[PDB]
Design a binder for these strands. Structure first.
Lengths: 164, 85, 131, 64, 218, 92
RNA sequence: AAGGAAAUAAAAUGGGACGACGUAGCAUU
RNA sequence: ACUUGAGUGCAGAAGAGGAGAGUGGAAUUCCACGUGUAGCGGUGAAAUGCGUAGAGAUGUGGAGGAACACCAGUGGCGAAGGCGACUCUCUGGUCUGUAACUGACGCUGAGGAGCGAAAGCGUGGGGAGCGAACAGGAUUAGAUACCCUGGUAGUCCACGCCGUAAACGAUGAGUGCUAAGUGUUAGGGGGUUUCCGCCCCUUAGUGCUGCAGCUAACGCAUUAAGCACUCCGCCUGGGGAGUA
């Protein structure tokens, strides 16, 4: 169930890599802008954009990210459990920490976690350092998260019975 | 063939239906290996027969080890009967 | 051969989960019976039945799906393998996903989970995890 | 096509006979392929063995 | 009980293993369809259809099959609902804006021929305008008045309409229809295991669904 | 058991052919073998010339022995000029 | 005469080489 | 204590499995003889070569050496290399229905041992054809090559030695589990039919297309590169260098 794009997002860009396409008349340049769009409350989205100009590609990536968001269970501004994202040779670990450690992660991971509404997290990249694969792995790890209430419902158990 | 096997079974039989006990199989393996060796004394170039003989000897040794780990008196008696040393 | 029954059972359950099957047949074994009963009483399995035969006996498990399509069991993993044994003390009993999951442990007073272990402050063979 | 042997259920080709082998051999004396006579693999192999055995004893023409 | 439906073509071994729980067998390498299961699934089909209609359903009837074109067209026309009998154009939903622009152009050109200056040029008109009118009426006749996206989707052969099914799943729009033995059952939200190559079967099914649709207005 | 079929050269008189056949049959039985049956096709057109003859006298003999009499028959056939061709096949 | 398994006839002989170094823009309005 | 893994027994099946002996007709070369003449052979073109001594061609016979046309098929066997004419003596392994037999006797395997394509080396034969080196002739500016005409070692055999290949499925061995469709080899059972035959199931082997899953992609996908366990070997940038 996709959520609507009507939210107070930040649309903070990450980077812009220049692209080249060869033609009989030499090379042809394109600007591929990858942007992460999200709100500071459990809403985040990754997007990509290609165009002959930087701002046009930025707008394309913003719209693309808006067209695909995802929720995250920010249990006390921290993840409920540790998980690993392994999307396309991108290994990124995520650990919950105390309420003062802060956002300890790489550039793109840090931006994603900031636009995701998460305060204190422990992370480490154990694979490729490519921003796109890292973002995909982080999003995969976020989607694979579990909530206490849903597990309690599925297990025919109570939350206090689970953790008490 | 099919006649020496019967005699070996009868000699090494423990019961009327005994046909797979370690002693009988070991005696059969010994007889077959002896025949194969006698054959090899002439056809030195038949290496496939040598490989078959090696497999038979490995089976015989594993069976001897199992017997020794199970029963020592029976193992010694079988060695004495076959003189396998 | 197969080097162990437990890893086989766990990986068969994992495969059944991946293909989204509803039944499973396993060569029954005392330890397998205890593990299946534990998984059942915990809510991972909707129900389990046993069959005492002349060969090995068969323990049949029924995978649980509490919604349209959602695997109550997401992944399995063994710890103590036949060649690398893992033993955890009462002070080092490992929690699974901050207690969200569960782990099985063999002790002297019976097969206990993480919660029962903490309750009895027991320890011993840490064999596998359950998510 | 159907196998002559299976249709007749005959076995033990008995190479010494040639009335049957004559049909399965071409005019020049060459053996016919299985894909033409529709015969089976086992029966084809046995028939070719018998045909060679017969040829060796001047019962079939190596060449013609 | 075998109702008036004759939907048991049973579609020999060109089948899908995922439909094992809706098939009997016959001595022709062919799987007799389990009519009993269909008689039950059609009940929830009618229920969901009536509910969505009372909610304002705009069911799109789609089938790119000769055996279904005229049937679905007649059913949609007698029911006054939407449909797509000819080719299923790419991006009816994902690119709904381009289709909207195209159909607005169609509306303009089809209102011009009788209200506007239909005699601007002696050859230009006959050369281009009427041919484009025919082509656009062919490719958009049944959806010429969509005006908004529907609440659900109806199809007749997802194996043939994999594109529409995929884009509907992307838009998470509930899709209904009839699944063939070679089709994917899980991909549909409201599945009806039955034969589709029979004109009588598809005619009966479409008629019943259109009746269920029309009964929500009461 | 083995099937011993051989061809006698046609340029042999009737009594000489009988004597040769009896000799070659004794060669087999003389080594402890026992003949179960025989068959003679008479003069037949050979598919090809062996040395000079286009025809030959096919003689068939069914024997059961311990692979000894048949070996003696094979050894003796290669020397005798009365037999043009011969073969041995295990009847199984 | 259609994408093709172990497998493929027909079918100009003759064209050898191009020193060095390096030339590119890019987003907030 | 037990039979499911394992092995034995029974009744059956196939196969270029191997070792030894023997046998067979095509085809090339040579020799002898009969007929017979301006050449034969060869390349893009030609040339070198043999030939008026009687060639080439044809016919009969003889000599000897190698391989086994049709069969022949991602067909079969073998641990691998590898194995295609046929008969015989010896010999190995595989598969199919068991329930009769013992009841865990099992998997891997450092080192070690053995086998191990072709090439090569020593001893002695053998030598028809092919053919490193080599000779001559075309070729080009050059041709120690591609092309053509001849040609030693070698290609064959018995013993011994070295133990290397893209020795490849570039994928170690064993076990268990994980949708289907379609050929094929060896088998078995059944639902009518004594059959011919159709269908369904059940083992092993060999191919093709494909779900989930895996993979950087190519692609693998019940014969995995899937989900796991046990054992051994292997890698820590390239050149240096598999060199000192």
């Amino acid at each position: 169930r996709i959520d609507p794009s009507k939210l107070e997002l930040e649309e903070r860009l990450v980077t812009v890599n220049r692209v080249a396409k060869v033609v009989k008349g030499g090379r042809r340049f394109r600007f591929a802008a990858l942007v992460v769009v999200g709100d500071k409350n459990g809403h985040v989205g990754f997007g990509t954009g290609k165009a002959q100009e930087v701002p046009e590609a930025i707008r394309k990536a913003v719209e693309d990210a808006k067209k695909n968001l995802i929720e995250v269970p920010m249990v006390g501004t921290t993840i409920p459990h540790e998980i690993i994202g392994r999307f396309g040779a991108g290994n990124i670990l995520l650990k919950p920490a105390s309420e003062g450690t802060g956002v300890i992660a790489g550039g793109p991971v840090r931006a994603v976690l900031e636009l995701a509404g998460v305060a204190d997290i422990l992370s480490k990249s154990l694979g490729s350092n490519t921003p796109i694969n890292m973002i995909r792995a982080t999003l995969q790890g976020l989607s694979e998260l579990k909530r206490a209430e849903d597990v309690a419902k599925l297990r025919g158990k109570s939350v206090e019975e689970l953790l008490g | 063939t099919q006649e020496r096997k019967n005699q070996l079974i009868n000699e090494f039989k423990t019961h009327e239906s005994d046909t797979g006990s370690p002693e009988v199989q070991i005696a059969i393996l010994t007889d077959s290996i002896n025949n194969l060796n006698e054959h090899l004394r002439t056809h030195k170039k038949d290496h496939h027969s040598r490989r078959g003989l090696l497999k038979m000897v490995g089976k015989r040794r594993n069976l001897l080890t199992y017997l020794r780990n199970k029963d020592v008196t029976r193992y010694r008696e079988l060695i004495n009967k076959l003189g396998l040393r | 051969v197969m080097t162990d029954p437990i890893a086989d059972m766990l990986t068969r359950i994992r495969n059944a989960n991946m293909v989204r099957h509803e039944k499973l047949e396993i060569p029954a074994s005392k330890l397998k019976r205890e593990i299946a009963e534990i998984l059942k009483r915990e809510g991972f399995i909707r129900d389990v039945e046993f069959v005492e035969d002349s060969k090995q006996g068969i323990i049949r498990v029924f995978l649980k799906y509490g919604q349209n399509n959602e695997r109550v069991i997401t992944g399995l993993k063994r710890i103590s393998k036949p060649g690398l044994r893992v033993y955890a003390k009462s002070n080092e009993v490992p929690r699974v996903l901050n207690g969200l999951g569960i782990a099985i442990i063999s002790t002297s007073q019976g097969v206990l989970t993480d919660k029962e272990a903490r309750a009895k402050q027991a320890g011993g063979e840490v064999l596998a995890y359950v998510w | 096509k159907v196998c002559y042997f299976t249709s007749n259920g005959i076995t033990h080709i008995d190479y010494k006979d040639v009335d049957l082998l004559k049909k399965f051999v071409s005019e020049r004396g060459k053996i016919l392929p299985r894909r033409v006579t529709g015969t089976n693999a086992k029966y084809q192999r046995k028939l070719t063995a018998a045909i060679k055995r017969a040829r060796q004893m001047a019962l079939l023409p190596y060449v013609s | 009980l075998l109702e008036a439906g004759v939907h048991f073509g049973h579609q020999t071994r060109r089948w899908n293993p995922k439909m094992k729980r809706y098939i009997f067998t016959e001595r022709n390498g062919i799987y007799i369809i389990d009519l009993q299961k269909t008689v039950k699934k059609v009940e929830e089909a009618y229920n969901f259809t009536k509910n969505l209609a009372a909610e304002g359903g705009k069911i799109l009837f789609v089938g790119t099959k000769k055996q279904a074109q005229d049937s679905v067209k007649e059913e949609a026309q007698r029911s006054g609902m939407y449909y797509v009998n000819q080719r299923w154009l790419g991006g009816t939903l994902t690119n709904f804006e381009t289709i909207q622009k195209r159909i607005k152009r169609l509306k303009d050109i089809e209102k011009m021929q009788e209200n506007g200056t239909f005699d601007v040029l002696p050859k230009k008109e006959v050369v281009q305008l009427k041919k484009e009118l025919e082509r656009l009426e062919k490719f958009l006749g049944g959806i010429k008045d969509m005006k908004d996206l529907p609440d659900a989707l109806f199809i007749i052969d997802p194996r043939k309409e994999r594109i529409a099914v995929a884009e509907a799943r992307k838009l998470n729009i509930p899709i209904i229809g009839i699944v063939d033995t070679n089709c994917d059952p899980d991909e549909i939200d409201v599945v009806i295991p039955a034969n589709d190559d029979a004109i009588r079967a598809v005619k009966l099914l479409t008629s019943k669904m259109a009746d269920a649709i029309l009964e929500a207005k009461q | 058991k083995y099937e011993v079929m051989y061809i006698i050269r046609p340029n042999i008189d009737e009594e000489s052919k009988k004597a040769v056949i009896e000799r070659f049959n004794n060669v087999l039985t003389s080594n402890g073998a026992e003949i179960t049956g025989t068959k003679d096709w008479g003069k037949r057109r050979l598919a090809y010339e062996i040395n000079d003859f286009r025809d030959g006298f096919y003689q068939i003999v069914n024997v059961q022995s311990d692979a000894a009499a048949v070996q003696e028959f094979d050894r003796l056939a290669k020397i005798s000029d009365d037999i043009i061709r011969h073969i041995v096949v295990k009847e199984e």
